[PDB]
Amino acid sequence: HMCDAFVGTWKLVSSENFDDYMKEVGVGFATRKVAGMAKPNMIISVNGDVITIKSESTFKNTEISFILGQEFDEVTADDRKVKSTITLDGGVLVHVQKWDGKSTTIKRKREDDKLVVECVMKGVTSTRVYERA
Numbered sequence: 614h615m616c617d618a619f620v621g622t623w624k625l626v627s628s629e630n631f632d633d634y635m636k637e638v639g640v641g642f643a644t645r646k647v648a649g650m651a652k653p654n655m656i657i658s659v660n661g662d663v664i665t666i667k668s669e670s671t672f673k674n675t676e677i678s679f680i681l682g683q684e685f686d687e688v689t690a691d692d693r694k695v696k697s698t699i700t701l702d703g704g705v706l707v708h709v710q711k712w713d714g715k716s717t718t719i720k721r722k723r724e725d726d727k728l729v730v731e732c733v734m735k736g737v738t739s740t741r742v743y744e745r746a
């Protein structure tokens with residue numbers, strides 16, 4: 614039952630400060646512009662200890678499956694090849710991506726009927742809000 618309230622299909626409804634977050638990460642102009650338009654569906658499921666998070670969109674589709682606390686390889690929407698670890702901390706999924714000596718943290722939280730996603734790179738934060746699809 615670890616992630617019960619995350620399971621489902623979630624559609625992006627709002628994005629704040631995502632262009633500046635992407636800039637801080639190192640994403641180039643064309644990817645920022647096209648990625649910033651998309652309204653992805655984030656599909657979260659659990660089978661045993663394995664959590665799967667898929668994002669489907671116009672831009673790119675992504676898929677990760679993982680066990681909490683166990684590092685894995687990820688290819689991000691912007692084509693970074695990262696080493697990721699996802700944990701549950703106080704009921705928040707905390708996703709850390711490491712690559713080229715850098716790090717970014719993505720938190721997925723249930724708040725009311727929404728899924729709120731906070732992305733942090735150095736001093737820049739972006740907030741993305743998703744509704745049930």
Ligand SMILES: Cc1ccsc1-c1cc(-c2ccccc2)c(-c2nnn[nH]2)c(N(C)C(C)C)n1
Binds near residue numbers: 640649655
């Ligand atoms: C470009 C970039 C740089 C650092 S992170 C990142 C990024 C990009 C996307 C995305 C996926 C498809 C279409 C458009 C953008 C998503 C995403 N996946 N699902 N929804 N947005 C995402 N997330 C982890 C989300 C959960 C915040 N992070």
